[PDB]
Structure 1
Amino acid sequence: SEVAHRFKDLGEENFKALVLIAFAQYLQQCPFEDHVKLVNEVTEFAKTCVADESAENCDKSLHTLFGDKLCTVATLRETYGEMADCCAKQEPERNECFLQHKDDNPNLPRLVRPEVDVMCTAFHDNEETFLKKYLYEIARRHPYFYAPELLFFAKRYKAAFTECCQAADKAACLLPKLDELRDEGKASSAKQRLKCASLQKFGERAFKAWAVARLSQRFPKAEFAEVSKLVTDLTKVHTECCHGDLLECADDRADLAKYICENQDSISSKLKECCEKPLLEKSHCIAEVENDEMPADLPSLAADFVESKDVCKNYAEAKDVFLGMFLYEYARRHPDYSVVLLLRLAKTYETTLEKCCAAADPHECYAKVFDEFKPLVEEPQNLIKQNCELFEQLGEYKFQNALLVRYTKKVPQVSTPTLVEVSRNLGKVGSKCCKHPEAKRMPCAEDYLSVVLNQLCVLHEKTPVSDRVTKCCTESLVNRRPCFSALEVDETYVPKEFNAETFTFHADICTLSEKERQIKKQTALVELVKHKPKATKEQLKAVMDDFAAFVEKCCKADDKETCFAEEGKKLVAASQAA
């Protein structure tokens, strides 16, 4: 009995949670109630098998059990049309059908948040339904959210209410803490969305490489043999979690933390504080620990990777282990390098050994490899420096508007919502990284760009409209950024024609706060740069300037929010002039 196996390990609590998340991520459009029902039944069933591990179907694979359960509501195509099909499928892959129908953009209405006076009450009355609702809403909106981490976010979410609810001014103690969690959650979510795409779209060898570089950077003292151990395990965990095997992923994840904490002195010295606390907190700690650490007297890379005469031979023996060793040896001494740069260097080295090794004299051919690294290392550096300077001259909002015009010109076909979203997140890097010393700037900036670009890629994978995006997305994982950086205004794009239905103006804009106000402006800039790509000096501003005027006036003009309609058509006349 598998289910009875996972139960004992995680326990009734975490098993119940890990199963709701799994259900929520599969049937995102399914109501809370129904999910809770199936979860309970699935939990009840579990508790019998614990005792008698051979009764009903306790001799089953979680997938068939989970699958059939969901299929008790999925067959309702009038609600979940294309789902019924997956149900009519079999075992080798009824699940595979589920995964390919996971949506990255829940057509689920915005999630509003009740006055501090209600959440507190509802929290106190029923603390269980209250937290269950929280996992259901997140997991159904983030189908790839790293499950084991969602549990950690829950414990925190609970403590945010458990405390603030008993404060003099709950709204003051809560709101902040809640806003802080809303952000950190979107990050963790994007980070893992990238990890799932590497295993799935680029294979495990790709993920393995990413892990070797990242871990080696973090634990420079660790031996290659150790790192590989960690890499193999960590890959398994994430392979499970990305496939939908949340229970085993959670279990395995816990086993890794246990190990890492045990062998400690072998791996890192900064683990001292992560190993002294709750499991959940221990896991989230290790995963975010600062690099250790780097060893004092370290030999030069040139020694065994370009000067030795055995290179080609060792590369032939075990190429993968050799390249793995190179990456680990280059990463440990370079925490100032972004992970994708280290992978770029590694890919360049491999490509070199492949052409050089089949030569009359390789040591002659591959002897100047490090000469090819220079450009690769400096490009990113120059890009960061020149984009951070601009950022701290325009601030975040102005900077975002910059990237918005920049990128809409690059790939006009892309839907406005995505561009606005992507550009916004891109701009947030400035605030996030630019304030860092060079030593930490690139790792910060470049890697975060990877996550952000991945979004665009996955969101675009939904409805392909620009082959240039497809090309840069699909081509290579490590060169996505450089690929996009090279892109320039699309000379084949044919400008849109403006129609009233394009941009609609209703007074309803005057009620939203600052954020949604900017986002409505930015969404305008994009629709603008789509109808007048070329002809645009900086005249765009002139128009964007006029747009603001429109909202202010019409929002504070005491006429029925009518001027909006009249002045709405008025600004259009002006906009075209420019």
Structure 2
Amino acid sequence: SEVAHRFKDLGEENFKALVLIAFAQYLQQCPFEDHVKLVNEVTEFAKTCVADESAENCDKSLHTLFGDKLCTVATLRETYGEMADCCAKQEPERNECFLQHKDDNPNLPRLVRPEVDVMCTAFHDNEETFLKKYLYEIARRHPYFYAPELLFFAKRYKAAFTECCQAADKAACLLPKLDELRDEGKASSAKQRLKCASLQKFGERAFKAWAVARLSQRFPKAEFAEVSKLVTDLTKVHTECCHGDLLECADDRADLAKYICENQDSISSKLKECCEKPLLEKSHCIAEVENDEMPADLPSLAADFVESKDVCKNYAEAKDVFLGMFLYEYARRHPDYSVVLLLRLAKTYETTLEKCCAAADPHECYAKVFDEFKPLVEEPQNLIKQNCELFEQLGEYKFQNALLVRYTKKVPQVSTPTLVEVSRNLGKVGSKCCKHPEAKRMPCAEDYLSVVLNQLCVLHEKTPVSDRVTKCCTESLVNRRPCFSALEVDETYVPKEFNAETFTFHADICTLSEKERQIKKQTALVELVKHKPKATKEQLKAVMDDFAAFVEKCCKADDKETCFAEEGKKLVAASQAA
């Protein structure tokens, strides 16, 4: 028995929670009730396997059990049409079918939230179904959410109500903590979506490279042999969580924290405080610890990597280990570099050793390698420096609007909603990183753009409309940013054509929050740039200036929200003029 295994390790709480998340992430459109049912039928079975370890099918692989359970509702194609197919499949992958069918953008209605007076009551009456509903909603809207981390977000979500419901001003104590969590959750989710895309679309060697750089940056004092161990394990953990195997991922993840904390003196000195607490908190801590201080007297890289005469020979012996050692050695002394830049230098070095080593005189050919690193390193520095300056003058909103115009011109085929969402997130880097010392600016900015751009890539892969996006997304994981910065204005795009249904105006806008108001304005700008790419400099503003006027007036005029229809057609006349 395996299901027996995981049960004993995670116990009832966690085991039950993880299974729900797994089920919710597979059948995102399936109602809460049904999921709870299967989860229970599923948990009950488990309990018997514990006692009798060969009873029904207790001898099974979680994949058959889980699969069959879901298939008791999936065969209902009138609800989940294309799902029934996966069910008719077999063992080798009646699952590859499921994972392949995950929606990164489910057509699930907005999740609005009941007055502080209800959530509190509902929470107190039944604390179980309240928290269960949380995970269900998150996991079903974020099919790649790092499961073990979702359990941590849950323990915090509970503590939010556990406390604020006992306030004097609940709405005051809650609202905050609830926002803060909604944001941090969308981040953790994007951070993880990139980790799964790497493994799934580029391979484990790719993820392994990213881990070596990252870990070496964080734990400079750690030895190469140690980092590899860590990289090996961490890779397996994420491979499982991304293959849909959450129970083993959670288990293995706990084992790693245990290890890392045990060999504390051998890895980092800033681990102490993470090793002193509740596991879930210990795991989230280690994963977010600050880099350790850099080892005092460190030799120069040129020594064993460009000046040694045995370079080519060692490369031939164990290239992967050699290049791994290079990356580890370069990253440990450069916490001021982003992880993609470090991977760019490593790829440039390998490429050089390849052509150089088959030469009539290596050491002569590869002897000036660091000369090619210069441009690679300066490029992001200049980009960061310049976009931060600009972001400072215009602020976040105006900056976002700049990227919006820019990016819609780059790839006009992309759907407006994605452009708006992506441009917004790109602008949010300014507030997030610009306020940092140049020593921490690049790692902050560039790696965050690797997450934001990945989101655009996974969202585009759904319905590919621009081969330029496909190319930049597929050609290189590490050069995605550089690829997109290089893109200019699509000279082959043909302007859209106005039609009524293009943009709808109903008064319903005057009720929405300040945010959804800007958003509707940004959605307008994108639609504008799609209809008038070229002609655009400052007619854009002049017009956007006009759109604001429209809303202001019509929302505060007291006619039926009629002017909306009349004046709606009025502005269109003006717009076209420009």
Q: TM-score range by the shorter chain?
A: over 0.9
Deviations 1:310-369 (A, max 9, x none): 001000100000000000000000000000000000000000001000000010000000
Cross-structure match for 1:396: 396
Deviations 1:424-455 (A, max 9, x none): 00000000000000000000000000000000
Q: Distance in 1 between matches of 2:328 and 2:542?
A: 52
Deviations 1:366-398 (A, max 9, x none): 000000000000000000000000001000000
Using the TM superposition, give the Cα deviation of residue 106 of structure 1 relative to its aligned residue in structure 2, in angstroms. 1.1
Using the TM superposition, give the Cα deviation of residue 401 of structure 1 relative to its aligned residue in structure 2, in angstroms. 0.2
Using the TM superposition, give the Cα deviation of residue 280 of structure 1 relative to its aligned residue in structure 2, in angstroms. 0.1
**DSSP 3-state at the match of 2:436:** coil
Using the TM superposition, give the Cα deviation of residue 521 of structure 1 relative to its aligned residue in structure 2, in angstroms. 0.4
Q: Distance in 2 between matches of 1:417 and 1:260?
A: 42
Using the TM superposition, give the Cα deviation of residue 113 of structure 1 relative to its aligned residue in structure 2, in angstroms. 0.4
Using the TM superposition, give the Cα deviation of residue 539 of structure 1 relative to its aligned residue in structure 2, in angstroms. 1.3
Q: Distance in 1 between matches of 2:359 and 2:457?
A: 39
Deviations 1:434-490 (A, max 9, x none): 000000000000000000000000000000000000000000000000000000000
* Number of residue-to-residue matches in the alignment: 578
Q: Distance in 1 between matches of 2:41 and 2:538?
A: 62
Q: Distance in 2 between matches of 1:139 and 1:537?
A: 43
**DSSP 3-state at the match of 1:505:** coil
Q: Distance in 2 between matches of 1:360 and 1:538?
A: 59
**DSSP 3-state at the match of 1:501:** helix
Q: Distance in 2 between matches of 1:179 and 1:537?
A: 37
Deviations 1:108-148 (A, max 9, x none): 00000000000000000000000000000000000000000
Q: Distance in 1 between matches of 2:212 and 2:537?
A: 47
Q: Distance in 2 between matches of 1:383 and 1:263?
A: 40
Q: Distance in 1 between matches of 2:114 and 2:350?
A: 56
**DSSP 3-state at the match of 2:220:** coil
**DSSP 3-state at the match of 2:501:** coil
Cross-structure match for 2:287: 287
Q: Distance in 1 between matches of 2:506 and 2:543?
A: 19
Q: Distance in 2 between matches of 1:538 and 1:355?
A: 50
Q: TM-score, normalised by structure 1?
A: 1.00
Identity %: 100
Q: Distance in 2 between matches of 1:426 and 1:8?
A: 44
**DSSP 3-state at the match of 2:263:** helix
Equivalent runs, 1:321-400 vs 2, <5 Å: 321-400=321-400
Cross-structure match for 1:30: 30
Deviations 1:486-527 (A, max 9, x none): 000000000001111000000000000110001100000000
Give 5+ residue unaligned stretches, structure 1: none
Q: Distance in 1 between matches of 2:114 and 2:317?
A: 63
Equivalent runs, 1:229-244 vs 2, <5 Å: 229-244=229-244
Using the TM superposition, give the Cα deviation of residue 301 of structure 1 relative to its aligned residue in structure 2, in angstroms. 0.3
Q: Distance in 2 between matches of 1:177 and 1:197?
A: 30
Deviations 1:246-301 (A, max 9, x none): 00000000000000000000000000100000000000000000000000000000
Q: Distance in 1 between matches of 2:211 and 2:91?
A: 32
Q: Distance in 2 between matches of 1:107 and 1:397?
A: 28
Q: TM-score, normalised by structure 2?
A: 1.00
Q: Distance in 1 between matches of 2:499 and 2:553?
A: 23
Deviations 1:212-258 (A, max 9, x none): 00000000000000000000000000000001000000000000000
Using the TM superposition, give the Cα deviation of residue 70 of structure 1 relative to its aligned residue in structure 2, in angstroms. 0.2
**DSSP 3-state at the match of 2:503:** coil
Using the TM superposition, give the Cα deviation of residue 560 of structure 1 relative to its aligned residue in structure 2, in angstroms. 0.5
Using the TM superposition, give the Cα deviation of residue 150 of structure 1 relative to its aligned residue in structure 2, in angstroms. 0.2
Q: Distance in 2 between matches of 1:378 and 1:173?
A: 46
Q: Distance in 2 between matches of 1:285 and 1:534?
A: 49
Cross-structure match for 1:308: 308
Using the TM superposition, give the Cα deviation of residue 537 of structure 1 relative to its aligned residue in structure 2, in angstroms. 1.6
Using the TM superposition, give the Cα deviation of residue 538 of structure 1 relative to its aligned residue in structure 2, in angstroms. 1.9
Using the TM superposition, give the Cα deviation of residue 187 of structure 1 relative to its aligned residue in structure 2, in angstroms. 0.2
Cross-structure match for 2:108: 108
Q: Distance in 1 between matches of 2:482 and 2:32?
A: 43
Runs ≥4 in structure 1, deviation > 4 angstroms?
none
Equivalent runs, 1:415-494 vs 2, <5 Å: 415-494=415-494
**DSSP 3-state at the match of 2:445:** helix
Cross-structure match for 1:135: 135
Indicate yes or no: 2:420 matched with 1:410.
no
Q: Distance in 1 between matches of 2:46 and 2:558?
A: 63
Q: Distance in 1 between matches of 2:148 and 2:366?
A: 45
Using the TM superposition, give the Cα deviation of residue 168 of structure 1 relative to its aligned residue in structure 2, in angstroms. 0.3
Deviations 1:168-192 (A, max 9, x none): 0000000000000000000000000
Q: Distance in 1 between matches of 2:510 and 2:455?
A: 30
